[PDB]
Amino acid sequence: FKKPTQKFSGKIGEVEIGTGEKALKLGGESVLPFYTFDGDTGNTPKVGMEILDVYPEDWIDPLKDIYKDVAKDPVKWAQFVEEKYSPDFICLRLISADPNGTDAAPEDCAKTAKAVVEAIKTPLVVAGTGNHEKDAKLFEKVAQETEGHNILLMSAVEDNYKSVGAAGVMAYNDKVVAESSVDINLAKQINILMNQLGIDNTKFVDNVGCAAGGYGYEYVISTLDRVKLAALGQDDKTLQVPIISPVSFEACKVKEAMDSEEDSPQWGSQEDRTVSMEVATASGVLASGTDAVILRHPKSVEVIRNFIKELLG
């Protein structure tokens, strides 16, 4: 036969998150994910672990049992995760900032983030709330407090991209996630707005949306396939940016992963279904063109890291 000679004219750009020896690189591939037989896969996809600035009340009981004496203090929580599981990066989700719940001033949350970033070596990704209006004020204060560590600000949608991008990349020399809603054109639009504002592809990463397996999952898969093919096959300069998809945010909130044995006796264990839900979701998005995923359960990280290592080595 004839070996498939697939030549792509594009190449994904590299974004560096963090500082020091623990800084990680994203992107750089000129072929489809895990296609070591086609060419150069730039940087191995990274796996990150999620923590909260408040005590996790809605997390499953097995997760609460792991983080017993460290969940109360985010500073202790971040150091516990770094020393025990050594994640590529730690995601700090500011749950206390959302107006829908225990709404708190942006100054309070930035003070929490300041202590965390100065207590760990691993790169930090500060995840904001769902509200576009609050994230503009929240990230302005957070990026000011945590200056000099090159954090990643997450969820900068078209609404607040001016506020988040300015207070992020341009002012305090951080990285920003440009988030769209499971569309290539919307992903292409937000990237153009960042470029026109003065932020080139090396300073922001892309979030084309994420979903749990079985809950609008094929929409995320199609978007990831389309952006990867356009960036490489069509040499689209406005899509040659690395992609980060938070899996634990969506995969761990579903009925199939949160229901315990009391609620659904036939479904079996709860911890197994929670880990199996994140592993399935993360593996599928990794194969579609995601350069970094965020996971919650420590066991999911070990499986995904082995999953990445087996395919690349």
Q: Which of 8, 34, 59, 172 contacts another protein by CB under 8 A?
A: 172
Contact string (CB under 8 A) for another protein, positions 246-275, x = contact: ------------------------------
Distance CA 154, CA 206 (A): 9
The smaller minimum CB distance to another protein, of residues 199 and 295, is found at 199
Residue 276 phi, psi dihedral angles, 5° rounding: -65, -25
The smaller minimum CB distance to another protein, of residues 76 and 162, is found at 162
Strands 15-17 and 24-26: antiparallel
Does position 170 interact with another protein (CB under 8 A)? The reply is yes
Q: Which of 234, 253, 255, 263 contacts another protein by CB under 8 A?
A: 234
**Span from 75-83, 118-126, 181-189, 297-305 in contact with another protein (CB under 8 A):** 181-189
The smaller minimum CB distance to another protein, of residues 44 and 180, is found at 180
- CA 193 to chain CA centroid, Å, is 21
Q: Which of 140, 174, 271, 278 contacts another protein by CB under 8 A?
A: 140
Does position 236 interact with another protein (CB under 8 A)? The reply is yes
The smaller minimum CB distance to another protein, of residues 196 and 266, is found at 196
Distance CA 239, CA 175 (A): 17
Distance CA 18, CA 21 (A): 9
The smaller minimum CB distance to another protein, of residues 23 and 193, is found at 193
Does position 32 interact with another protein (CB under 8 A)? The reply is no
The smaller minimum CB distance to another protein, of residues 163 and 288, is found at 163
Does position 9 interact with another protein (CB under 8 A)? The reply is no
Q: Which residues 189-228 are close enough to bind another protein by CB under 8 A?
A: 189, 192-193, 197-198, 226
Using alpha carbons only, give the angle 257, 261, 265 rounded to the nearest 5 degrees.
110
Does position 171 interact with another protein (CB under 8 A)? The reply is yes
Does position 39 interact with another protein (CB under 8 A)? The reply is no
- Write the DSSP string, 120-179: -SS-EEEE--S-HHHHHHHHHHHHHHS-SS--EEEEE-TTTHHHHHIIIIIHH--EEEEE
The smaller minimum CB distance to another protein, of residues 75 and 229, is found at 229
Q: How far is the CB of 1 from another protein (least distance, A)?
A: 26
Query: Could you tell me if 179 and 214 are in contact, meaning their C-beta atoms sit under 8 angstroms apart?
Result: no
Does position 183 interact with another protein (CB under 8 A)? The reply is yes
Distance CA 237, CA 242 (A): 12
Q: Among positive and negative, which fits the CA dihedral 245, 213, 135, 238?
A: positive
Query: Could you tell me if 49 and 85 are in contact, meaning their C-beta atoms sit under 8 angstroms apart?
Result: yes
Using alpha carbons only, give the angle 34, 216, 252 rounded to the nearest 5 degrees.
80
Q: How far is the CB of 145 from another protein (least distance, A)?
A: 13
Distance CA 164, CA 137 (A): 8
Residues that bind another protein (CB under 8 A): 136, 140, 144, 162-163, 165-167, 170-172, 183-185, 189, 192-193, 197-198, 226, 229-230, 233-234, 236
